[PDB]
């Protein structure tokens, strides 16, 4: 049921920046979501083989998860905050594509997304 390689968390030829907004995304946004009671499905790439979701990566062609995001932030992988925000948005939207309203995974994504947006609304202005 083979899994694809997980998304990269480093890329030496990719140009990178550190910004106060990206630091906030790690210290506040990622850390807050990571500790949540509904974080567990999202702390690592979907193991479609072991979870018996054989069509997961047949439907989801741009997978993303908070384990990947956490390592990207720790590795200063991003050029700007928007790039990181895009990864969270991909993670949530993949759930809404793969699953139906009311599925536990969707309820979890929705709760995390609500919290994510609350924290993003307080993103500091870039210094
Ligand atoms: O859109 N579908 C998604 C989906 C489906 C299932 C899971 C999921 N992930 C796990 C992990 C938890 C840690 N141990 C390895 C397995 N376990 C599960 C799991 C197991 C049983 N029931 C629900 C989820 C994670 C996700 C993220 C997006």
From Swiss-Prot:
Q: Where in the cell is it found?
A: Nucleus; Chromosome
Which residues belong to any copy of the Bromo domain?
17-123
| Glycyl lysine isopeptide (Lys-Gly) (interchain with G-Cter in SUMO2) cross-link, chain position(s) | 58
Recorded domain comment: The NET domain mediates interaction with a number of chromatin proteins involved in transcription regulation (NSD3, JMJD6, CHD4, GLTSCR1 and ATAD5).
Task: Describe the function of this protein.
Answer: Chromatin reader protein that recognizes and binds acetylated histones and plays a key role in transmission of epigenetic memory across cell divisions and transcription regulation. Remains associated with acetylated chromatin throughout the entire cell cycle and provides epigenetic memory for postmitotic G1 gene transcription by preserving acetylated chromatin status and maintaining high-order chromatin structure. During interphase, plays a key role in regulating the transcription of signal-inducible genes by associating with the P-TEFb complex and recruiting it to promoters.
| Subunit details | Interacts with p53/TP53; the interaction is direct. Interacts (via CTD region) with CDK9 and CCNT1, acting as an associated component of P-TEFb complex. Interacts with RELA (when acetylated at 'Lys-310'). Interacts (via NET domain) with NSD3, CHD4, BICRA and ATAD5. The interaction with BICRA bridges BRD4 to the GBAF complex. Interacts (via NET domain) with JMJD6 (via JmjC and N-terminal domains); the interaction is stronger in presence of ssRNA and recruits JMJD6 on distal enhancers. Interacts with NSD3. Interacts with NIPBL.
Q: What is this protein called?
A: Bromodomain-containing protein 4
Q: Which organism is it from?
A: Homo sapiens
Q: The organism's lineage?
A: Eukaryota, Metazoa, Chordata, Craniata, Vertebrata
Q: What gene name is listed for this protein?
A: BRD4
């Amino acid at each position: 049921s083979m899994n694809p390689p997980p998304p990269e968390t480093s890329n030496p030829n990719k140009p990178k920046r550190q910004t106060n907004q990206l630091q906030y995304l790690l210290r506040v946004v990622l850390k807050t979501l990571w500790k949540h009671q509904f974080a567990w499905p999202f702390q690592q790439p979907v193991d479609a083989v072991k979870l018996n979701l054989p069509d997961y990566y047949k439907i989801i062609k741009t997978p993303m998860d908070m384990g990947t995001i956490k390592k990207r932030l720790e590795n200063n992988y991003y050029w700007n905050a928007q790039e990181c925000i895009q990864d969270f948005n991909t993670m949530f939207t993949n759930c809404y594509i793969y699953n139906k309203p009311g599925d536990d995974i969707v309820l979890m994504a929705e709760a995390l997304e609500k919290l994510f947006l609350q924290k993003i609304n307080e993103l500091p202005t870039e210094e």
